Tab-separated table of C-alpha atoms in Angstrom:
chain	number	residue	atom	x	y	z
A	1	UNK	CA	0.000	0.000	0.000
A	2	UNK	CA	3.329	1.763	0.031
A	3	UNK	CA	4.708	0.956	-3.012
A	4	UNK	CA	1.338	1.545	-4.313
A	5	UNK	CA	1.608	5.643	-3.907
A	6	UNK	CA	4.337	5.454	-6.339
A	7	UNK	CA	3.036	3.119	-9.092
A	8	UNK	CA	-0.127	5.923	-9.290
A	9	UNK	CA	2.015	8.622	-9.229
A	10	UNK	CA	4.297	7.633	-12.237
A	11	UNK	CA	1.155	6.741	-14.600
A	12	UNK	CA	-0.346	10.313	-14.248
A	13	UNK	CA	3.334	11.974	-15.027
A	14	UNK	CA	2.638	9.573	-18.918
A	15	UNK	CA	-1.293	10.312	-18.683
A	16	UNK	CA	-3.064	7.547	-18.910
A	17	UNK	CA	-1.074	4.811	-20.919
A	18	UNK	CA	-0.088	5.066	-24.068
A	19	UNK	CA	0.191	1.579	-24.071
A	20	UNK	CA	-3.378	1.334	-24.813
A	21	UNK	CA	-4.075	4.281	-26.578
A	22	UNK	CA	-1.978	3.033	-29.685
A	23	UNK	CA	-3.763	-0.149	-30.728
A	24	UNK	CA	-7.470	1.777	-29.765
A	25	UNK	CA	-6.070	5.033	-32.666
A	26	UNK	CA	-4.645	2.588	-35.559
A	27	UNK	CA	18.688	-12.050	-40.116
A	28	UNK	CA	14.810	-12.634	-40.001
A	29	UNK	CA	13.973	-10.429	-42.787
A	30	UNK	CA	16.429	-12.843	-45.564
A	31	UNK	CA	14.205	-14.709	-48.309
A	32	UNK	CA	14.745	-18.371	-48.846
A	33	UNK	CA	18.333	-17.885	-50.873
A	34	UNK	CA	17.754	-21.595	-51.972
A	35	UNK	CA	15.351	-20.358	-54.888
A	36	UNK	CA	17.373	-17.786	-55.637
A	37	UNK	CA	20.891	-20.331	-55.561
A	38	UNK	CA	19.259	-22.508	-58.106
A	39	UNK	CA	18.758	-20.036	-60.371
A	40	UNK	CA	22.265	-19.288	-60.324
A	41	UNK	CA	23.670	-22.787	-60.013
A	42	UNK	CA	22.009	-23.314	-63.784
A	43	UNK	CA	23.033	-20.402	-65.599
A	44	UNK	CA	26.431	-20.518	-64.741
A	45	UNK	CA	27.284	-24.479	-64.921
A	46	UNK	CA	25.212	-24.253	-68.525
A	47	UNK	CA	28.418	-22.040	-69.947
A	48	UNK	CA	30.885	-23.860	-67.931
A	49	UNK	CA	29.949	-27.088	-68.763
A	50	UNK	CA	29.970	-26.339	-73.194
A	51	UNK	CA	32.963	-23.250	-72.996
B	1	UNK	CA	10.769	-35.045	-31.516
B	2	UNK	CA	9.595	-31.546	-29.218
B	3	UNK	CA	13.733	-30.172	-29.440
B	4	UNK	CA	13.150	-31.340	-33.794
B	5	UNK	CA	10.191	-29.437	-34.056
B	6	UNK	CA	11.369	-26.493	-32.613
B	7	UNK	CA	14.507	-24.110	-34.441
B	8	UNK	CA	16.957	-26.096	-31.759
B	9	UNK	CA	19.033	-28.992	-33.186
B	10	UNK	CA	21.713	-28.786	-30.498
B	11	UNK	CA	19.653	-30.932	-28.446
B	12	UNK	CA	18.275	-33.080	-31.208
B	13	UNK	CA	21.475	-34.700	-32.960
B	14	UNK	CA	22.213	-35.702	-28.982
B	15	UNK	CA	18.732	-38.127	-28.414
B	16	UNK	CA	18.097	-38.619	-32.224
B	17	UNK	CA	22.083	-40.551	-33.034
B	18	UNK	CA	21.821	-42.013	-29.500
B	19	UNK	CA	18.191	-43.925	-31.188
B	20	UNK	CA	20.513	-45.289	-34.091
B	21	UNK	CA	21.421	-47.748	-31.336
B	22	UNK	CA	17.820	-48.255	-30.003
B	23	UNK	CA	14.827	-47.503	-31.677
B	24	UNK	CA	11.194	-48.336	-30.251
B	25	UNK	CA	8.566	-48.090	-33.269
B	26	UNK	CA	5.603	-48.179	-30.829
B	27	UNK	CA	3.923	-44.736	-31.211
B	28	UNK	CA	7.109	-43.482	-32.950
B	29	UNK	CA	7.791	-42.511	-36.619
B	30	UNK	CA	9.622	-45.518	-38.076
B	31	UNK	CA	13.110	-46.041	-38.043
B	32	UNK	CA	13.830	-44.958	-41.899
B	33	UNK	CA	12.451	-41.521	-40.705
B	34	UNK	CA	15.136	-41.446	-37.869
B	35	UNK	CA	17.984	-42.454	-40.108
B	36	UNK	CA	17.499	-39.755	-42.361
B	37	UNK	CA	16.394	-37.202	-39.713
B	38	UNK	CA	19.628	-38.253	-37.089
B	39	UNK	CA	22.197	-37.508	-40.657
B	40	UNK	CA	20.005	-33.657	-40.539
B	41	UNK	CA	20.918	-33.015	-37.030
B	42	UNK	CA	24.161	-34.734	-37.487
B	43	UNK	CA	26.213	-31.902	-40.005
B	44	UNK	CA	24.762	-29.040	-38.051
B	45	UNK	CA	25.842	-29.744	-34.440
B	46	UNK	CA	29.297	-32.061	-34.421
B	47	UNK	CA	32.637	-30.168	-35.227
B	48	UNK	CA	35.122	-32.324	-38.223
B	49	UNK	CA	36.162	-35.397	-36.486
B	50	UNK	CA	33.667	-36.370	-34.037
B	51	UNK	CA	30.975	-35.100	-35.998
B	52	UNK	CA	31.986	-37.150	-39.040
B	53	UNK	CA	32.425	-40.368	-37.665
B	54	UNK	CA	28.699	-40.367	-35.926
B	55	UNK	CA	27.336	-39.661	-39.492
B	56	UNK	CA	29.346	-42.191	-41.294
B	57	UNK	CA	31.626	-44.852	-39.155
B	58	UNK	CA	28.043	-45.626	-37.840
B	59	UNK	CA	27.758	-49.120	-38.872
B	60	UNK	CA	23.850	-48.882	-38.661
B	61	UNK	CA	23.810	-45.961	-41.926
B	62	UNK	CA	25.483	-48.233	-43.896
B	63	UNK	CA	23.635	-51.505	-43.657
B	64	UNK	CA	20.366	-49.528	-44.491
B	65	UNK	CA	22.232	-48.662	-47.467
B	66	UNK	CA	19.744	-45.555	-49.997
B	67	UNK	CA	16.711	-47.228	-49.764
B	68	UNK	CA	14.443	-44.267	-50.358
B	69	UNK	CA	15.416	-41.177	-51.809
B	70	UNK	CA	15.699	-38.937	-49.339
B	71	UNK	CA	17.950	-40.528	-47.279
B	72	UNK	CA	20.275	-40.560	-50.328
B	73	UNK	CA	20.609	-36.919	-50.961
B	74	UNK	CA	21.274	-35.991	-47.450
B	75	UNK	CA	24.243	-39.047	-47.269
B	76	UNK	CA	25.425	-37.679	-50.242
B	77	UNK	CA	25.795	-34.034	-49.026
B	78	UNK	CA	27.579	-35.245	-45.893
B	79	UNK	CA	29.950	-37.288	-47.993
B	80	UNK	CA	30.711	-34.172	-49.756
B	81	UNK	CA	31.195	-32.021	-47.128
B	82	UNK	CA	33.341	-34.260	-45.795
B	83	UNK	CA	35.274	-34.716	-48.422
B	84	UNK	CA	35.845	-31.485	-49.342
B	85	UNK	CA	34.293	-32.123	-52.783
B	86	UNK	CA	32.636	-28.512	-53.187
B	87	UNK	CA	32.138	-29.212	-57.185
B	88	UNK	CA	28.978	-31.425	-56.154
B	89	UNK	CA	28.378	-29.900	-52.977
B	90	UNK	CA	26.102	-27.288	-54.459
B	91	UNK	CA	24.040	-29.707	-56.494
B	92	UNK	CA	23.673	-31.762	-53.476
B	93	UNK	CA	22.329	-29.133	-51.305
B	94	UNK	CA	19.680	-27.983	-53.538
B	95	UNK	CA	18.639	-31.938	-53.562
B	96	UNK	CA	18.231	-31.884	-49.918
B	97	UNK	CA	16.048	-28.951	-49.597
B	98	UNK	CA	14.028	-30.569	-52.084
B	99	UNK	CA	13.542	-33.961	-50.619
B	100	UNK	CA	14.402	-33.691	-47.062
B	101	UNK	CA	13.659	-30.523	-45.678
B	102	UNK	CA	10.174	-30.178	-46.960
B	103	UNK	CA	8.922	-33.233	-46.688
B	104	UNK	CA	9.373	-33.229	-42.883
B	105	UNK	CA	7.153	-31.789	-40.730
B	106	UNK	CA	9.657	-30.427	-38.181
B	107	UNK	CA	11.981	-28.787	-40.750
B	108	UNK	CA	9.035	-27.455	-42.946
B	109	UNK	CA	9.535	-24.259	-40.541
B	110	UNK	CA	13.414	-24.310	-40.198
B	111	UNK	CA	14.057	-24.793	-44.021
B	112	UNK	CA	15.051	-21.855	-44.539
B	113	UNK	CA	17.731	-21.061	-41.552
B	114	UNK	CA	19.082	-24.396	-42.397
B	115	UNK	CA	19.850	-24.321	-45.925
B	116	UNK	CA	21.550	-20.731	-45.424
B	117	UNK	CA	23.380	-22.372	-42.609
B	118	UNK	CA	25.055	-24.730	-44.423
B	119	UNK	CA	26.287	-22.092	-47.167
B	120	UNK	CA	28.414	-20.465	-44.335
B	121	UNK	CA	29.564	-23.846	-42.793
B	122	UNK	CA	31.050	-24.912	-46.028
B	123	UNK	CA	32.858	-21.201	-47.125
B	124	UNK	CA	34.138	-21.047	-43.776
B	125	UNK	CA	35.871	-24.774	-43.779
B	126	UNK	CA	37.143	-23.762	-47.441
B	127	UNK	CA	38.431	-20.126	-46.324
B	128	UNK	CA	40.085	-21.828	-42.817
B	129	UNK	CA	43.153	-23.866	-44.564
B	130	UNK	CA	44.091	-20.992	-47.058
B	131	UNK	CA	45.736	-17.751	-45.803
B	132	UNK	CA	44.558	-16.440	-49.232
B	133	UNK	CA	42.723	-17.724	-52.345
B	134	UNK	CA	41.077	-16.005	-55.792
B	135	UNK	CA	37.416	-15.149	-56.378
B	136	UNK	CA	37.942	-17.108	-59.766
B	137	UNK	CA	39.302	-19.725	-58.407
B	138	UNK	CA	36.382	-20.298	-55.633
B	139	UNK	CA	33.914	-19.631	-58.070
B	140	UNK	CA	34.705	-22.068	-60.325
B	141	UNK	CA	35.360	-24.538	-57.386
B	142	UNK	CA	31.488	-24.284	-56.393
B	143	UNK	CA	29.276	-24.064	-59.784
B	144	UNK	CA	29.047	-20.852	-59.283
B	145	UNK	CA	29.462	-17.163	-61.407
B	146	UNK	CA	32.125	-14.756	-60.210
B	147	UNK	CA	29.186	-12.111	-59.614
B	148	UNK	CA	27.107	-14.461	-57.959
B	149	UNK	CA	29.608	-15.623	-55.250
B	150	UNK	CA	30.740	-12.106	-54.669
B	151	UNK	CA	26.618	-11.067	-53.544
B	152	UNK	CA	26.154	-14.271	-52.104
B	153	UNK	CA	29.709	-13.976	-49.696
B	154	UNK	CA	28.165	-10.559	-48.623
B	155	UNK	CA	25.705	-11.522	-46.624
B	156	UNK	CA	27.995	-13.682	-44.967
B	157	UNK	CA	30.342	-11.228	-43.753
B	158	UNK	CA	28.997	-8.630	-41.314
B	159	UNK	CA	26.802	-11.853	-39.875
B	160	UNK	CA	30.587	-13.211	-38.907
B	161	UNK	CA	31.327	-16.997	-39.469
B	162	UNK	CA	34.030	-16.872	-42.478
B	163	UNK	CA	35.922	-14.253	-40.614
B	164	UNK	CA	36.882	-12.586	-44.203
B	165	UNK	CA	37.082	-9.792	-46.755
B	166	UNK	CA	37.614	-9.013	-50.234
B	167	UNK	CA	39.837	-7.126	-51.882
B	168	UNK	CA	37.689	-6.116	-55.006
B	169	UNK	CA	39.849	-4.259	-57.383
B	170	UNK	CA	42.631	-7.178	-56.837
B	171	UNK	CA	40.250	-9.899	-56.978
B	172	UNK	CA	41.854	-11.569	-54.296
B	173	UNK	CA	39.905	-13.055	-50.702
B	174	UNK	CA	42.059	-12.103	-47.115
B	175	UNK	CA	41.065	-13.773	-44.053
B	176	UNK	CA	41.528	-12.432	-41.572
B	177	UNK	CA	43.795	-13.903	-38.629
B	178	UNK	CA	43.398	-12.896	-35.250
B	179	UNK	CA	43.352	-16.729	-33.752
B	180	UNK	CA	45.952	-16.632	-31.471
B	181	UNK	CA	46.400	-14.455	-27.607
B	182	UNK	CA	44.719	-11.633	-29.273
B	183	UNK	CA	41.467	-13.312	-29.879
B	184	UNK	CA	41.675	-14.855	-26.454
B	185	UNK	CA	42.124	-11.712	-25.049
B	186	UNK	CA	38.906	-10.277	-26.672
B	187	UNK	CA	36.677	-12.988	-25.352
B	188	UNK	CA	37.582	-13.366	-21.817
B	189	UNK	CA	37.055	-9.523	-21.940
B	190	UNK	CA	33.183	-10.058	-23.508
B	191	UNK	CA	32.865	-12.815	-20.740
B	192	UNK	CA	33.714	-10.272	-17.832
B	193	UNK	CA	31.413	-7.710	-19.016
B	194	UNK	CA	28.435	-10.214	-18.922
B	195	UNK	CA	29.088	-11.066	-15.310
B	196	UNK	CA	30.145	-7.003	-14.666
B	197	UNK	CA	26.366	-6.070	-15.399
B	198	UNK	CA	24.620	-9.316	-13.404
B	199	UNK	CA	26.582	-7.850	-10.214
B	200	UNK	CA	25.433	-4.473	-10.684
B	201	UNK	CA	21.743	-5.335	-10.838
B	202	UNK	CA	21.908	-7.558	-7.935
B	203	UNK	CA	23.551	-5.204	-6.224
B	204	UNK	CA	21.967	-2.650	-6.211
B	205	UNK	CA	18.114	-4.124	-5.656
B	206	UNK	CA	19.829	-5.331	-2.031
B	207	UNK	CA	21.094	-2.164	-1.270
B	208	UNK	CA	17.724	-0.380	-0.814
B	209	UNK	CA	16.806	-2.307	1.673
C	1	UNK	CA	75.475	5.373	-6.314
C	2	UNK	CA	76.667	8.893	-5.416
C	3	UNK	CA	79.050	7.397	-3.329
C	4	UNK	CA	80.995	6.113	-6.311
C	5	UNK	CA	80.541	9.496	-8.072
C	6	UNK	CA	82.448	11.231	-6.266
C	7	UNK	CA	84.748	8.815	-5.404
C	8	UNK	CA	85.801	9.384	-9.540
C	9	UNK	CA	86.170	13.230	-9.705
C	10	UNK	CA	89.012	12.615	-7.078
C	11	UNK	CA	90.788	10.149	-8.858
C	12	UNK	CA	91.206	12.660	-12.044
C	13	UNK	CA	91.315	15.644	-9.627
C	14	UNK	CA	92.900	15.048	-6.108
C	15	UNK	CA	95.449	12.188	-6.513
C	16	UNK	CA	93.712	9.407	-5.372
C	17	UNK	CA	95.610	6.410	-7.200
C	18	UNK	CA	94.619	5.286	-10.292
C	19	UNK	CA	93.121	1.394	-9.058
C	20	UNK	CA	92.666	-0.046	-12.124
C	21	UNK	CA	90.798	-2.816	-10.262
C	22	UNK	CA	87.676	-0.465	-9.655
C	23	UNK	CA	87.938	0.864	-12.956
C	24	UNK	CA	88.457	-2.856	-14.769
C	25	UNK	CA	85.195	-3.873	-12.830
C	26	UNK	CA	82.790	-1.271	-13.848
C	27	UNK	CA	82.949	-2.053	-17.751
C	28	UNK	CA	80.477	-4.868	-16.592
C	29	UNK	CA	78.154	-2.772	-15.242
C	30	UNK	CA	77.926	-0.604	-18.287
C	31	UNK	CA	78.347	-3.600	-21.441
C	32	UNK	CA	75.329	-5.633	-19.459
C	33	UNK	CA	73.037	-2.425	-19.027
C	34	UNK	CA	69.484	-3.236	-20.399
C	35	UNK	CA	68.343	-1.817	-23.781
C	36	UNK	CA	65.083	-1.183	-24.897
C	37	UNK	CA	63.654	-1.818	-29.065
C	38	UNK	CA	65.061	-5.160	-27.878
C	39	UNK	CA	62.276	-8.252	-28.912
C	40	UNK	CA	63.233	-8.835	-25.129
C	41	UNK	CA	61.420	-5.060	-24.603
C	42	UNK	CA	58.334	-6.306	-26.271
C	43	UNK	CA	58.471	-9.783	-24.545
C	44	UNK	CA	58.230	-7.720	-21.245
C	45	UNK	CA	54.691	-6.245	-22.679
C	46	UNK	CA	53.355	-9.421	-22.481
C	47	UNK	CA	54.055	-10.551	-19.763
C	48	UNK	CA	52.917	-7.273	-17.871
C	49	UNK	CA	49.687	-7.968	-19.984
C	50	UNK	CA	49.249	-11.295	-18.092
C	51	UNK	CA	49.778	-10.314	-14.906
C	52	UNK	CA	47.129	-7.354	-15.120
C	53	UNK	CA	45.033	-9.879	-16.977
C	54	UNK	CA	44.911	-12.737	-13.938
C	55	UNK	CA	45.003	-9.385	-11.447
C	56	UNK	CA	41.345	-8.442	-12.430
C	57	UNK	CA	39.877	-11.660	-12.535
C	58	UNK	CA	40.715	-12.575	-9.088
C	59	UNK	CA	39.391	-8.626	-7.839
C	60	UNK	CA	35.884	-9.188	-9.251
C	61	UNK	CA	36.142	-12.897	-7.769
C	62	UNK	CA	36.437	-10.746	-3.819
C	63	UNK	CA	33.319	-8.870	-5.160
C	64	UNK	CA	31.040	-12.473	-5.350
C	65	UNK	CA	32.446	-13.830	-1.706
C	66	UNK	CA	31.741	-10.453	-0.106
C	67	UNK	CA	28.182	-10.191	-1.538
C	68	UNK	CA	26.668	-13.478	-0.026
């Protein structure tokens, strides 16, 4: 009931949340590189192979 | 099966070559499945030696032979590997994603970390026993164009396994070599600034009372 | 150090013999003096490196026992 004066405090310094007011208004990105590997595995063996 | 299905193979390639001795089919996806699934696991956790000989001095792998095809292409990529045959490892890999990554379950979701992975684990071994080679010469080595290594090494590089550069103009690939006191100096440093913080933290949430 | 100073301005300047014995033995001191740009110089860096190195483990290893 202490700690409690505090927690009230802070939240009135934001107003209100924030938190909540956003949803109420509104190398993880890399593609598969095996399609794109293929792809360039052919071409390039295709010339090799009959040079 | 739970450690498969999730990104994790350390823990994996530990239970799953451990069932190469004993397998149970009772409520359990038959042994073939293992075989193939255990050689997976296998490449992406042991280091050269010990990793090599469970994935192929295991009698077991052998007497099963390449009874279905997807057990072949993934055999086939670790005897490449191995051998440091990197003509045919390209073709191989592309087999495997194929035939062995997709048609599991478990790896359906981790396809495409592990095919990527495997890129890196092979340019690094390459790079590791030569204090310098030639674009052309690597390129041809793989199956690859010049151009296409060059984009394909530079996503590689800031990500850190090959531990390398290019010199462009020159045409030549420098690795760089700080593997000695140096690089065990910078470690132990990284090490002591984890446990620096932890004290902190804990120290100071005592200290108020 | 200063002792054998200006024990040598006499010798030159007040007639104190010339004891070629004290003379003969400090060429040692001066043909073994330490040099530095030496690979000895640099071998000394390392080592000091080392001894810093093991001295700051073993300080935040106090800090642990202390805190229980």
């Amino acid at each position: 009931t202490k700690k409690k004066n505090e927690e009230i405090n802070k939240k009135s310094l934001e107003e209100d949340d924030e938190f909540e007011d956003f949803p109420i208004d509104t190398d993880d990105v890399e593609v598969d590189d095996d399609f794109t590997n293929e792809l360039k595995a052919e071409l390039d063996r295709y010339k090799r192979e009959n040079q | 099966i739970h450690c498969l299905a999730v990104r994790n193979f350390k823990e994996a390639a530990k239970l799953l070559v451990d069932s190469l001795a004993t397998f149970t089919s009772i409520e359990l996806t038959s042994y073939e499945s293992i075989a193939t699934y255990a050689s997976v696991t296998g490449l992406f956790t042991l280091e050269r030696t010990d990793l090599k000989s469970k994935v192929i001095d295991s009698p077991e792998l052998l007497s099963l032979i390449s009874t279905t095809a997807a057990l072949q292409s993934i055999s086939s990529l670790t005897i490449s590997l191995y051998a440091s045959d990197y003509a045919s490892y390209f073709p191989y890999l592309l087999e495997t994603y194929a035939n062995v990554l997709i048609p599991c379950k478990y790896l359906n979701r981790h396809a495409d970390f592990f095919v990527r992975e495997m890129r890196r684990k092979v340019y690094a071994q390459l790079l590791e026993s030569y204090k310098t080679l030639s674009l052309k010469s690597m390129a041809s080595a793989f199956g690859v164009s010049v151009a296409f290594l060059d984009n394909d090494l530079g996503k590689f590089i800031p990500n850190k396994q090959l531990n390398c550069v290019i010199d462009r103009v020159n045409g030549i690939v420098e690795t760089n070599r700080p593997d000695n006191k140096n690089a065990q100096y910078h470690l132990l440093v990284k090490q002591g600034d984890g446990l620096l913080t932890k004290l902190q933290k804990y120290g100071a949430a005592v200290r108020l009372t | 150090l200063k002792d054998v100073v200006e024990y040598l301005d006499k010798v030159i300047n007040k007639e104190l013999p010339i004891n070629h014995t004290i003379l003969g033995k400090l060429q040692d001191v001066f043909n073994l003096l330490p040099n530095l740009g030496t690979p000895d110089d640099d071998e000394i860096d390392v080592e000091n490196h080392d001894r810093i190195n093991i001295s700051n483990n073993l300080q935040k290893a106090l800090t642990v026992k202390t805190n229980d």
